[PDB]
Amino acid sequence: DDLTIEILTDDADYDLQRFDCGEEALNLFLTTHLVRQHRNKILRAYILCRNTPERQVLGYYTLCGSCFERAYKNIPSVTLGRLAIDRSLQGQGWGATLVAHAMNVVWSASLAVGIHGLFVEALNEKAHTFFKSLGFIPLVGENENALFFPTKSIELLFTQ
Amino acid sequence: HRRVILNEESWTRVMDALSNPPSPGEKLKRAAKRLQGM
Ligand SMILES: [Cl-]
């Protein structure tokens, strides 16, 4: 395959204007906010691209360190806040491959500093179903848009 | 985009996920195998 998954490169140029995932909010985030938020350290942005000098982006995901707390304890974690796949690639399982990439990054970081899980943001029922099919535990009430996956399950994915 | 996750009974679901971690399903295993050789 011609496609690769890599973290956004600090001094590289990307072809993003053409990107279309079907959600207007995720498109505008990529073409006006993603690059500056990554470079300004607000998040860590990972790109699915064509591995050409032109760097045509056909999907992306964003990560940021977080902590989960109850209305007692604390959970050092990582949040996957955005996931978008271009319409041209949809149906080939690229969304799931990007989550597996994310999980491997989060796993490596747990092995280094100690992170107990991965939280994900699902703004709609189609994404919630997608994250549930990948094994994420759905949270309820105020946390209805969040799903959780522990580091121990990620370790199981890349060791068995 | 959440750096402060504030839980309630969602807290027990996360606690239970930590003590009883889910087994990776076939869909996720496929994604992991696709990622392996890329
Ligand atoms: Cl997918």
Which residues on B lie below 8 Å from A99 (Cβ)?
28, 31
**Ramachandran angles phi, psi of A139, nearest 5°:** -90, 160
Distance B23 CA to ligand 1 centre (A): 19
Please identify every residue whose CB atom is under 5 Å from ligand 1, which is an ion: A 93, 95-96
Residue A31 in contact with partner chain B when CB distance is under 8 A: no
Amino acid symbol at A142: E
DSSP H stretches of helix in chain A: 24-32, 34-39, 94-113, 125-133, 151-159
Q: Are A44 and A82 in contact (CB under 8 A)?
A: no
Closest partner residue to B31 (CB to CB) among A97, A117, A140 is A97
CA atoms within 13 A on the CB side of A89: 23
| Inter-chain CB proximity A100 and B35 less than 8 Å | yes
CA A137/CA B5 separation, integer angstroms: 15
Cα–Cα dist B23/A144, whole Å: 22
Round to whole Å and give the CA distance between B34 and A80. Answer: 20
Tokens of residue A48, six digits:
């699915």
Contacts of A23 (CB under 8 A, 6+ apart): A84
- Looking up tokens 């690639």 gives A89
For chain A, first and last CA: distance in Å? 25
DSSP, res A42? S
All residues of chain B having their beta carbon less than 8 Å from the beta carbon of residue A104 are 35
Calculated CA dihedral for residues A158, A159, B5, B7, nearest 10 degrees: 130
- Domain residue extents for chain B: 1-38
- Domain residues of chain A, as ranges? 1-160
Residues 1-38 (B) with a CB less than 8 A from some CB of A: 1-11, 13-14, 17-18, 21-25, 27-32, 34-35, 38
Question: CA A153 from chain center: how many Å?
Answer: 17
Cβ(B28)–Cβ(B36) under 8 Å? Answer: no
Least Cα separation, residue A43 to chain B (angstroms): 9
Cβ-based neighbours of B19, under 8 Å, separated by 6 or more: none
Q: Which of A38, A143, A106, A62 is nearest to B4 (CA)?
A: A143
**CA–CA separation, B37 vs A103, rounded Å?**
16
Strand partners, A36: none
Answer yes or no: are the C-beta atoms of A138 and A83 closer than 8 Å. no
Q: How was this structure determined?
A: X-ray
The two counts, helices (H) then strands (E), for chain A are 5, 7
- CB-neighbour burial class of residue A62 (10 A; exposed 0-12, middle 13-18, buried 19+): buried
In chain B, at which residue ranges do the beta strands (DSSP E only) sit? 4-7
Expressed in Å, this structure's resolution amounts to 2.5
| Residues A93/A131, Cβ–Cβ less than 8 Å | no
Element housing B29 (H / E): helix B26-36
Residue A25: how many CB atoms within 10 A of its CB?
Answer: 10
Q: Which residues of B touch A69 (CB under 8 A)?
A: 4-7
Sign of the dihedral defined by the CA atoms of residues A94, A96, A100, A103, in that order? positive
